[PDB]
Each structure stands twice: as C-alpha cells, then as structure tokens.
Design a protein around this nucleic acid. Structure first.
Lengths: 101, 102
DNA sequence: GTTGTACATTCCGTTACTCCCT
DNA sequence: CAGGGAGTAACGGAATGTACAAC
C-alpha cells in the first residue's frame, strides 16, 4: 500500500526494507533514511542543507562532507557507479538527485 | 475462541501468553513476552526506548540503559531472526526498535 | 531460567587525501 | 598554474549486539 517502487527497486517504509530486482539489499538506518528522502523527492535536486535538516537535523555550515560520504556509502550498496550514476546523480553546486528514469 | 494477533507463521496468544512460530511454542519469560507484545501491537511503528522501558520495567529511559537491547536480542534469538539481517525486528539508530509485519 | 554487565561489534561523522572542473 | 567542489578510505567515538557471569 505505502510501498513506493521504481523500475526494479522497491522501498518499503512499513518494514524498512528495500529490494533491487528480486534481491534484497541490506541497508543501514542512514542508508535507508537517506534513500527514502531522495526517492520522496524523485527527480528533485535535494540540496545539502535540506538533507541535513530532514535527516539529523543540523545546520549546513558551508563546510560539511557527511552528506557526500553518506551518498557514496549509499551509491556502493545500491550498485551504482559514481563515475556515471544511473540512480543517484550529483549536480555541481546544487546537491544530489534521485533518478526515476 | 482465543483472540490473538498474527503475522504469517508467527502467532501471539495473549490469553495464556504463549507465542508460536509455525509451528511450535516459543518460550519467553514474562518480561519478554510483555516487550514482544508491546512491539507487535504497534507493528510497522517505531517504538523508542522510553516507550519500551515504560512497559518492560515501567521506568523512564535514563541511560545508557541497555535492558531493552539484550531483551531485543533474546526475541531475535527466540524468533529465529538474524541481527545483521533482521526480518521481523528492525533496529533504527537513535530511535528505537520496530516490529516488521512482513 | 531470568537478567544485564562487560566486553564484542558495527555505524557514520570527521578527516584527509585524491582527481576533477572552472 | 591557482581554487574549490566532489569521491571515498580510513580513523575512532559512540550506538548497538550478546556470551556468560551473577542471581
């Protein structure tokens, strides 16, 4: 009912469980809460300050790389090469974007 | 004629406080069936440590109090769940624990 | 059999580089 | 021939998992 899917990727907030085309991908608490955020605003550029607020929530001090680190850890577990990402795009000086297609 | 709650093969019978998985009776102590009961009646809903402790021992989460965590570990053990890849009981950092209805 | 301490293990924020891009 | 914005490896402090001690 509340489960929100994309392509072969299913994100279930009721059981806090995510599946990538049959296979069940193990995500930590941050991996999930971060992916959930992005997917909610799919195709929408989420800016760094906006991420920290919704997820921590603290103020972006203009110099904080935790979101970047969080993104990389997510990118690896989702099987998404950062060199040319299919799922989670980087947008220079804006933030990050979840790609539905 | 017994009123219970059920999630797949799992079955929780608050009448005689007997839980079954499948299957066969799972032995829980009193304080542990209580905590399982709290979680399961708020399935899909994150129960924080204060919420739990207010039932587990009827106190307020002060610490650093770890009585819930070990308790969560027994349930996971007793429900044939694996902590690193938990199906039925999820850990949510800084929040608490969660009974997953599926 | 019950319970939680005393370790055992994992998480994620910081740091510290690195290669980009401008 | 800066300057900075983004990737991630690694460190380590704190949040969580539990074998087994104390009951």
């Amino acid at each position: 009912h509340k489960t929100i899917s994309f392509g072969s990727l299913t994100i279930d907030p009721v059981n806090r469980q995510v599946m990538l085309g049959g296979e069940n991908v193990a995500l930590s608490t941050a991996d999930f809460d971060m992916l959930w955020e992005l997917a909610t605003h799919a195709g929408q550029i989420m800016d760094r300050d906006a991420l920290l607020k919704n997820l921590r929530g603290v103020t972006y001090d203009g110099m904080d790389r935790s979101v970047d680190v969080a993104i990389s850890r997510l990118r690896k577990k989702l099987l998404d090469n950062a060199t040319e990402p299919y799922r989670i795009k980087t947008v220079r000086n804006k933030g990050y974007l979840f790609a539905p297609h």
